[PDB]
């Protein structure tokens, strides 16, 4: 009936586009909120091993990871699906963006390309981390100090900059693209936000070495 | 043969906005060995003359009859009401700019896409004189040349290609095989490198995901599968 | 409104139209090709048989020359043709076949060895030249002596038009498909273009150009049964007829092809009768040596078609709900053979009929095929009553054919003829240039032609377009067939005249829309009827039997008082075509003689022995 | 110099599209040979856990999971990049390919959709499984337990179909499209490959229960 | 050669040219507007001052009429 | 417009009046153009568009390039 050309899905046009982008913004926003909570609650090794063990038992023995593990698992893959839409896979999309971004000297343009490299590194390394710690074994700080340092998990340095780099540019972009920023307020947002990120690399890198 | 064929014909007319798409039901008595060409021409020339179908030869070698018949892009005139079920559904070809009802514009696409691929014999121009004798050609090469130049440019293998329907800049089994028909012709003086410049970058050859709907919908039976195949190798082996 | 310019406007995109556009464009003029459907699909594509040009390469053509070709051509045309036209054509066919072969057609070539052919319904062995291997192969066809017909498997039309079109794209011919010409743009007997109709929007367009060509092809859809594609109403004819300046030539000459398929009316090729065809009767008896003893089904066409309706009146046809018919036997020919493995008439019988040719017999009946007359031209192809109008093709009367067209010569006429007429068009355009007065394009033309559209749309004048169409079909099928008598002809012309009156008051069953597909046919009903009575009244007042025109009351050929061409003008506003007559080539190279088949009874020419051989100034040098 | 457009790379033209397509096909063959290696070695528990353990401590000190494990991780994701070019992430590529795919009623056309859905599932669970067994702990038949009973790896009832379907349609596809085609050999290839796929899923599900 | 048709040919597409094309096209006539550069960028676009026309609105023009316009125009301009 | 001598500006152009003249003059001259066109219609003899036009003017181009009379156009512009 409409299995042909005409125009889109209903008797006038499709609304799928705005809904679809919007839900990329809310998968980015809700997922940003999770990573805040993760690097707050479980970033407690340096405060006390007892504190993280307890705050994990705070909600259903390691923060309800049977209802919260599949939450960030399936929702993080659904993010991957919504964003892979724009990812420069086509060898020409790469070729062009690399020349345009290297010729322009423009920063945020060039930050999109790192948003990309970061995204593939965290699908792989992240899916295997999130999974290895998501499989039962309710949390102990002493068992986590287990892996880290042996498992062998370690790394996360090859994850933490890529990860928070990504989340950072992601907050910055989501703010601009829908209008929560300047010109007027613009620089405050970028410098503020670059500080948010560099701070997250700090409390993460020391949550990391102190977990050891 | 006396059984009652009921047709649901796509109906749309872009020139007056008030016309929305819909499904219109028709009623025809079937006689012996009746083509859908007969059915439709009587539906039009009898009941509603403003139905637009594109008919040329009713012998099946032109390609204006193209449409979707009960789900498959196919040929209306060259398809007979024996093989079809009791109710039929005729849809305009996809991918192609719909002009109205069952009619689409194909040849426009073939000419743009033709220049894209530059399908003609490129004459090195040795100052050939039709005063003098003609070209040397074995019978079997010129016979597969006939097998490929035989395409009737109906539009079925594109309208059945998911790649094309999904990516409009994809140029189609048609275009791949056409370049094939100039590759294997000697009279076309073209370097294999030229051929890559035409179909070797993506959107023709490596754009194909291999659905094989071309091979399976082609009415005149071009050897699309293995010609497409031998072309993706010949071009893909541009590498060192 | 929406005025376009060019130099060379080719009205029709098929095979001649394409060749001519390619020559205007080879010498570099700007060109518009109007086409009812994409140029690829025309009726030239449905051509299954082959392309006739004298070669000399095949063993079964050994020694063939355009002398033989011309000779055969004229004989087939019943000395109804211009022998200047046919000389030029016979010598220009090879130039054109080497040329088009060089454009990449996949001509089937020769294979050295000894092969087992078929001449009659019996095979004979024959060798094939050892030194002419890859040259261009031919086949037996029509009334040829040697085998000159050059082919690509089955669809030769597909394969010749197809490379002709690639040459079109290469040289950049702008093509507006879906353009139905309606009137011609003229005044002062000078032609400035045509007014046309967008087959998409629905509004008129008006191409303006110096040199204009009519490629529109045959008018056969005025008949119930025809091998013609449904796009053949003869547009350029009906637009050159409504001018009343340029006439229609030899209009009555309507060639019927014998092997027209019975259930669908589709044509099965004559390469079938050309390689061991077998025409059989209800009892399956090969009856051609009974009527035409030596040349049998390789006889002239109007001959075999005539003999078949004879043999069928006797009571010997096969009886079908589709009507009684005879059989064509190619099972004779072999299975893995079928004109190179596939044959594409194999698919005709396979999909449309219930017959497999390697087993059963093809129901076949004489049915309408080529249409000889058309827009009259000259030796250089300029149309008659109006300056700057050109024509080539089926729509044209060049009269290289006369009163019967020899099989396979129309392809060679499209490229041979498109090349020549084009050449003259090229240098005429590179000559003087007109003045486009808009009280021609605007006054009338857009006005009169927009006016007939309005009258056909809004008005009372109620008559259903399909009743005048189908009543016309019955009138032509019964009135003017293969076998014709005086009284059924006049009876027909009388009802056709009143039907023209009725066809001026037309109504549409429909509700108007931007581009209504009904109006396309309804506005051309009047035109269809008109050139149909040009054929009918041309045949009534021509009392003699020549070519496919066979009069039961005047069976002899009657060279004395008709060796000529029936030119039909129209002039307003009338209900009847005016009939004027004109000499068939005074050039006579081969004076009137016997064809060497058929039942020829001639009233021998008396006047001509004056002139006969006087080939004085030959600008046939090319 | 050439930093805007007009044509390609170097002084005239770029062959990168063919090279990379050739590389999508070379990844397809190499990955198919591996997944044969995996469905030989690890399907040997039907025959005996001694044959699987033995041939498992055989290859280059147990298939060199130092030097060969990274082979298949980097190679499987590299495949992932080469294929994501064509994956219907855009909401209209999906919507259309679903409308066309339901109307054509044509088979191989619809299997492209399974190559896709399977593709995301075997991305995630393929990475996370390949990782949990890709680590240290040299291999035993006993280790599973990394499946089954007390084990919480229940997913090879999901991973096995998606994987062996994908490898099947992929083996079939890489045959056509590159000239190993028919149509003569097309059917013998068609039910050869159909047979091959359902056969590997059976002896896989029987390796799965005969691991229990 | 390479001939184009229209009803109204505007040689220049700038500000005068555009208005005239707009009323010919407002009455629905085929019109070609030729321009040495895209119509936006012309010299009419560089005009910074303003456009002089009778209003009746401004408080510094209250009572303003085309009489004064006609007069000042003629008189600053000599004849 | 400015290209035109309508002479609403005379020998001194009124400030702000040149914008007013292009749009006002477009309205008025335009209305008049729709009148003269919508009326009688001409005949484009190609011995005008083709002969001369293309002939004389392509002659100026060919004489400027392939020909003698060698002098630099810039020196003549600046002088
Ligand atoms: C089944 C069939 C088989 C044939 N087999 C042979 C054969 O074997 N050997 C042989 O020599 N000849 C054969 N012929 C004859 C052949 O059709 C003609 O002699 C020739 O090929 C037609 O070419 P054409 O260019 O003059 O016109 P066409 O090919 O008939 O086409 C006319 C062109 O003008 C266009 N046109 C149509 N109507 C209009 C309009 N109102 N206004 C403007 N443009 C219009 C058309 O779109 C078309 O492009 C066969 C014909 C048929 C029908
Ligand atoms: C700096 C400057 C400031 C001005 N400020 C004001 C102001 O503030 N208020 C005011 O009222 N007036 C002002 N004017 C005057 C103003 O420029 C004109 O009176 C008017 O605005 C020009 O508009 P126009 O469309 O008639 O012509 P133009 O703006 O001069 O445009 C010329 C058109 O003709 C096209 N054309 C050019 N050459 C050719 C060619 N060889 N062949 C074919 N087509 C061609 C052009 O490409 C263009 O489209 C100013 C002028 C200048 C230079
Ligand atoms: C059951 C039979 C058996 C002894 C299986 C274990 C041995 C294994 C798994 C070898 C792995 C393996 C397989 C299955 C191949 O097919 C292949 C093809 C080409 C080169 C190398 C290989 C390879 O190493
Ligand atoms: C497979 C996993 C992931 C992939 C493929 C991925 C990739 C992407 C891509 C390609 C975009 C760009 C959208 C655009 O350019 O318009 C994006 C945006 C974003 N990403 Fe990720 N990322 C992943 C994981 C994460 C994680 C772990 C976070 C952590 C909070 C995150 C947060 C964000 C945010 C906030 C945005 C901005 C949303 C928007 O632009 O509307 N992503 N991501
Ligand atoms: C249910 C979801 C999650 C849970 C229960 C969780 C919990 C944990 C646990 C227990 C550790 C072990 C600490 C150690 O290694 O000593 C850890 C470390 C880590 N995990 Fe997660 N996490 C989750 C989601 C994520 C996500 C979405 C990411 C994205 C990359 C991530 C990345 C990391 C990183 C980067 C570290 C160490 C770096 C640091 O702490 O600064 N995790 N997490
Ligand atoms: C993240 C991992 C993977 C993703 C996202 C993925 C997805 C895809 C997709 C969408 C295609 C279709 C390419 C096209 O239609 O042109 C493809 C091709 C293919 N896949 Fe994978 N797949 C993955 C891993 C695998 C696995 C585990 C195998 C198992 C043997 C495999 C074998 C193949 C083969 C042989 C092809 C055909 C190659 C070609 O078309 O040139 N892939 N893959
Ligand atoms: C070096 C790479 C790999 C090795 C040595 C390996 C080894 C194994 C082992 C020991 C098992 C049995 C128990 C378990 O799953 O814990 C297994 C099962 C399985 N693995 Fe892997 N694995 C590797 C990578 C992969 C890859 C690339 C895939 C691709 C999908 C895969 C998919 C599966 C599946 C589906 C099963 C269970 C299905 C069945 O037995 O039929 N593995 N593999
Ligand atoms: C969004 C997901 C992650 C992004 C993945 C996108 C896939 C595309 C990545 C590869 C694209 C590389 O883009 C460009 O390719 C060309 C051709 O191969 C390379 O070209 C280079 O290597 C080739 C191959 O030897 C040489 O012939 C050439 O002289 C040299 O310049 C460029 O160095 C590279 O910049
Ligand atoms: C391996 C790669 C995997 C591919 C990526 C993951 C799947 C593709 C992601 C985008 C899917 C788009 O989603 C598609 O269209 C819209 C969403 O706007 C959904 O919503 C609706 O769309 C149209 C309606 O006009 C319908 O075809 C569909 O039935 C309906 O659900 C569809 O259910 C879904 O088919
Ligand atoms: O039947 C054929 O082969 C063609 C005959 C003709 O038109 O000459
Ligand atoms: S391939 Fe088959 S379908 Fe596509 S055009 Fe050539 S013939 Fe028509
Ligand atoms: S259907 Fe499509 S992908 Fe190539 S295989 Fe045929 S064009
Ligand atoms: S109508 Fe001519 S091919 Fe179908």
Author numbering:
A (entry chain O), D (entry chain C): 1 to 212
B (entry chain B): 1 to 240
C (entry chain A): 1 to 622
E (entry chain M): 1 to 79
F (entry chain M): 393 to 471
Quote the authors verbatim.
One of these crucial enzymes is quinol:fumarate reductase (QFR), which is an integral membrane protein with three subunits: a flavoprotein (subunit A), an iron-sulphur protein (subunit B), and a membrane-embedded subunit (subunit C). QFR catalyzes the coupled reduction of fumarate to succinate with the oxidation of hydroquinone (quinol) to quinone on opposite sides of the inner cytoplasmic membrane. We have determined the crystal structure of QFR from D. gigas at 3.6 Å resolution by X-ray crystallography. All the redox cofactors and a bound menaquinone are revealed in our structure.
Two hetero-trimeric complexes, each comprising subunits A, B and C, form one stable homo-dimer (A2B2C2) with major contacts between two C subunits. The main driving force in the homo-dimer formation thus comes from interactions between the C subunits. The C8M methyl group of the flavin of FAD binds to the FAD-binding domain through a covalent bond with residue His-A43, which is conserved among these A subunits of QFRs. A fumarate molecule is also observed near the FAD in the A subunit. The high-potential heme bH is proximal to the hydrophilic A and B subunits, and has as axial ligands His-C79 and His-C166 on helices α3 and α6, respectively. The low-potential heme bL, which is located distal to the hydrophilic A and B subunits, is coordinated to His-C38 and His-C129 on helices α1 and α5, respectively. One n-dodecyl β-D-maltoside (DDM) molecule from the detergent used to solubilize and stabilize the protein is found in subunit C of D. gigas QFR. Instead, we have identified a new bound menaquinone near helix 1 and heme bL in the QFR structure of D. gigas. The Tyr-C63 that binds MK exhibits the lowest B-factor compared to the three other free Tyr63 residues of the asymmetric subunits C (i.e., G-chain, K-chain and O-chain), which might result from the formation of the hydrogen bond between the side-chain O–H of the C-chain Tyr-C63 and the bound MK. We propose that this bound menaquinone (MK) serves as a novel redox cofactor, or a coupling site to gate the proton-coupled electron transport across the membrane in D. gigas QFR.
